[PDB]
């Protein structure tokens, strides 16, 4: 309703860098809010794309941001009669970024890895990797849970079980309130997908430069499966956390698997041991149900609700025609131990190929009426196809079914405005939470400041 679309603030990265591809708010140890921005095609040392991360101080006028530096050099370690190799070219550092406390985690899902041993090898594959920074102290660490030292032939002889070579760890990421980093790795176990978790504190304390293969003992990884419903499900394409079993001591995980079951799609809610508590199935094959997930209580009863995006959903129209517009599903969490039901609300796109539901951001309570609200992106939506973000307000029965406000992309065609979104943080400290919108195709980020409601609704 009350985001201000007149005086925006723009931040900008290098041309071609895809600055804005991912972003998050970051609070320093004194609570000053900044914006961390991933730019997964930023040029590295060999004038080769490797990705990069920027840490943008808040300023109404926006502008350029300093880099948050990470080591971009390929590494080699000859040890235990093997050769370990990391390959950073085109790794897409900054394809995901998240902030927790005063730490920043930025991931490179396509970082490759190989292990040589005489004439054999593991195979050079994208295991992905994450880079952790504490900007104030300069501390750095890394976490790459799918690196292995097993040779190719061993996987063949063992029928490709527990094969974490194509994980793409860091493809998605999230951090629990207690500080457990949770990485989605949709290539995990031969393209089933897996999750990897470890406390941030333990990642820092167990990491040293140059080791390349090291143990994080408190880490926990999900499981392989022989069930074909999971094959090529990309479980972990998106991830989130929240409270779904009534017990405030345990954190539950929400995992999108947009091609689960021969592309039907699914989203699963799991306990922290990866035991499945509920499964939501997509409605339509190939709609990419689970591309995005969001967790927030929208109807003010204190219980977290789940939103799921299916950006390629095809709506039925006149004369047995189908129109690809995208759809968002709202599931309200019921009182006490009970299955999430059918969806409480379906929000459906209007613009052909607009991809409504491609991203969904909790806004906290934008208009301050006591119900949390959300922003849904349609990166190619709007009447001109340039991208729109739509705001939906919470209320006692769930969400309003018509947007209270629509933000049309201020960028040119192709910017993919809305592809990343983050809300619920008050960046200018005026008592209203604000919204940041990435437009990686234009290498920019737009900040929308929430302002006092003009007339309430």
């Amino acid at each position, epitope marked *: 309703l009350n985001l201000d679309p007149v005086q925006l603030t723009f931040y900008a990265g290098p041309n071609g860098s895809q600055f804005g591809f991912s972003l998050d708010f970051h609070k320093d140890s004194h609570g000053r809010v900044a914006i961390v921005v991933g730019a997964p095609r930023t040029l590295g040392p060999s004038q080769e794309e490797t990705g990069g991360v920027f840490l943008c101080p808040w300023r109404a006028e926006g502008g350029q941001c300093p880099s948050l530096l990470f080591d971009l050099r390929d590494e080699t370690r000859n040890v235990g009669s093997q050769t370990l190799q990391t390959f950073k070219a085109r790794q897409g550092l900054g394809a995901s970024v998240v902030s927790w406390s005063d730490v920043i985690v930025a991931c490179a899902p396509w970082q490759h890895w190989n292990v040589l041993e005489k004439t054999e090898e593991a195979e050079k594959t994208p295991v992905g990797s994450c880079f952790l920074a504490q900007p104030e102290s300069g501390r750095r660490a890394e976490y790459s849970p799918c690196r292995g030292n097993t040779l190719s032939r061993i996987y063949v002889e063992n029928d490709f079980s527990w094969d974490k070579r194509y994980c793409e760890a860091g493809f998605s990421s999230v951090v629990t309130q207690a500080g457990e980093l949770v990485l989605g790795a949709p290539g995990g176990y031969y393209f089933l997908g897996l999750l990897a978790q470890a406390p941030v504190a333990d990642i820092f304390s167990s990491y040293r430069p140059g080791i390349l293969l090291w143990h994080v*003992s408190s880490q926990s990884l999900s499981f392989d499966s022989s069930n074909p419903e999971y094959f090529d499900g990309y479980w972990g394409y998106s991830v989130a956390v929240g409270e779904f079993d009534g017990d405030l001591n345990t954190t539950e995980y929400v995992v999108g698997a947009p091609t689960w079951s021969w592309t039907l799609g699914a989203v699963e809610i799991l306990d922290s041991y990866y035991q499945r508590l509920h499964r939501l199935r997509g409605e339509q094959m190939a709609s990419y149900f689970g591309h995005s997930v969001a967790v927030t209580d929208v109807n003010g009863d204190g219980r977290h609700d789940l939103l799921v995006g299916a950006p390629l959903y095809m709506e039925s129209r006149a004369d047995r025609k189908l129109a690809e517009v995208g759809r968002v599903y709202l599931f309200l969490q019921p009182r006490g131990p009970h299955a999430l039901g059918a969806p409480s609300l379906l929000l459906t796109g209007t613009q052909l190929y607009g991809r409504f539901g491609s991203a969904i951001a909790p806004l906290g309570d934008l208009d301050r009426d006591g119900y949390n609200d959300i922003a849904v992106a349609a990166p190619y939506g709007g009447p001109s196809g340039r991208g729109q973000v739509l705001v939906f307000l919470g209320q006692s029965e769930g969400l309003r079914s018509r947007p209270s406000q629509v933000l049309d992309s201020p960028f040119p065609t192709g910017s993919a405005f809305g592809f990343s979104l983050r809300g619920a943080v008050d960046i200018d400290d005026n008592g209203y939470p604000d919204l940041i919108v990435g437009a990686y195709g234009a290498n920019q980020v737009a900040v929308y400041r929430a302002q006092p409601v003009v007339k309430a609704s």
Partner: antibody
Amino acid sequence: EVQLQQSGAELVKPGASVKLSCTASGFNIKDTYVHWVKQRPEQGLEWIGRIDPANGYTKYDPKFQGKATITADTSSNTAYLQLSSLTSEDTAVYYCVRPLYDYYAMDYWGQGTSVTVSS
Amino acid sequence: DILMTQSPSSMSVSLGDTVSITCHASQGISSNIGWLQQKPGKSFMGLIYYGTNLVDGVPSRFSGSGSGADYSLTISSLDSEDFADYYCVQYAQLPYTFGGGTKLEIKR
């Protein structure tokens, strides 16, 4: 807290066999490589081999092939060193070892198990 | 196999001293070396991994340095509990191989 707890002193006859154990306390034996090392006063320290108890795969210094078999059982969180065709020269102290962080290192040691081979 | 020649075999030193034990390898091992301590009639504790990294719990008066084929353990300001045996181990190649050790004894 990681501890490696090895079985008691062994006293055996030339030609017999013996099977030493090393039980993980405070952690899962499956988390890392587990190595076996031999120590004698004159000859000093010698690496026997290792096992990845997750999958049973082993490596040995060739000087010990046929003498030493290293196995593991995640169920009981234990790794084993089995010595065959015992000789006086097998009289030594045996240690199980695992890395701390570095996959390839040798940081945590069991308390040691004396093996004495005599008639 | 890689030979680890450790020196000196022993040294008679005093509390407060700074001493260094060296290790020379028959070929370069790029910091894939560990240092170990064994107190009299006791088991081993790890001190250093990968050339320069303190094992958790080890006091910082211990340090490791070196590169290529030559490495050192240095103990600044010797403590009474430092009079013990020390060994290096290389893990650049299988089989892992050890130095002959060094025993710190008390000067009188």
